[PDB]
Design a protein around this ligand. Structure first.
Ligand code: 7OA
Lengths: 148, 140
């Protein structure tokens, strides 16, 4: 489906790095966050939905994901929270693979930037616009096709 | 065109709000930023290129958009460098939601959500977010 996403967090350099993955296209949206708090996770979710059609988000059952803010955000935007990744191994592998590959790219360009923040955005660019087609191409196709 | 955008920055409540408008579709991207440094403009553009196909970016002559930081940015990404109305439409929607939000920040991600998605009252019935997908998808 075109509106299914997976919000998880992978740590690096003693930093948090939030990671949202369009499951259908594999397109990724990532950003270094101060800490795995609820408001930070919610801001990220509010923005992703304000840019893409977000209808369901598969979270991990953590404290940040069950935060009152994340609930308010999922309600105000119409996002259906589903703590499924912790109990579905088929969905677990997806978040696992994307996080490690994103981690690989983040290292390949880490020396090209002093801060991790910039390094991850450079890594996101690489992942989405590189490859059939690239991830950023698949998601626009997925969405526009559904728009029939 | 499918890759043409326009970067400018606006101030509200004494805070900076960077803004990027896909010209064909009217799709918006905004964020409260710390200050108009040009190093920030470069960061904002970098992730923007990471998610959307950014081919050219039409800016003004300000010091932030002309920084060498920005030039290195467009060079690593492939961007070719070169609006107030859209800026005031957001100021309006943000005024409608600011009283409902605790921080301008969230109020701008909320007013953005509305514009790109819950603003379908125009020719064709699509939202700005539906249009950019239409535009980019067609190019393919
Ligand atoms: C259940 C919540 C309502 C609890 N609170 C809000 C916080 O949870 C979120 C945290 C957050 C930060 C992010 F960075 C991103 C997020 F997604 C969320 N802040 C927020 O503004 O969220 C808002 C809007 C933005 O996200 C959606 O979720 C909630 C709504 C909704 C749109 S609150 O502190 O108790 C509170 C704050 C102001 C306010 N004004 C009032 N006005 C009347 C005169 C009384 S009542 C009232 C209560």
């Amino acid at each position: 489906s075109p509106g299914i996403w997976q919000l998880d967090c992978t740590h690096l350099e003693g930093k948090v790095i939030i990671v949202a993955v369009h499951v259908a296209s594999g397109y990724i949206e990532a950003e270094v966050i101060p800490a795995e708090t609820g408001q930070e996770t919610a801001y990220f979710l509010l923005k992703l939905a304000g840019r893409w059609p977000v209808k369901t988000v598969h979270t991990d059952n953590g404290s940040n994901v069950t935060s009152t803010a994340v609930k308010a955000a999922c309600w105000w935007a119409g996002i259906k929270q589903e703590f499924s990744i912790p109990y579905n191994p088929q969905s677990r592998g997806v978040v696992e693979s994307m996080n490690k590959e994103l981690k690989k790219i983040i290292g390949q360009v880490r020396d090209q930037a002093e801060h991790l923040k910039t390094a991850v955005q450079m890594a996101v660019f690489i992942h989405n616009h590189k490859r059939g087609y690239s991830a950023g191409e698949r998601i626009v196709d997925i969405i526009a096709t559904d728009l029939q």
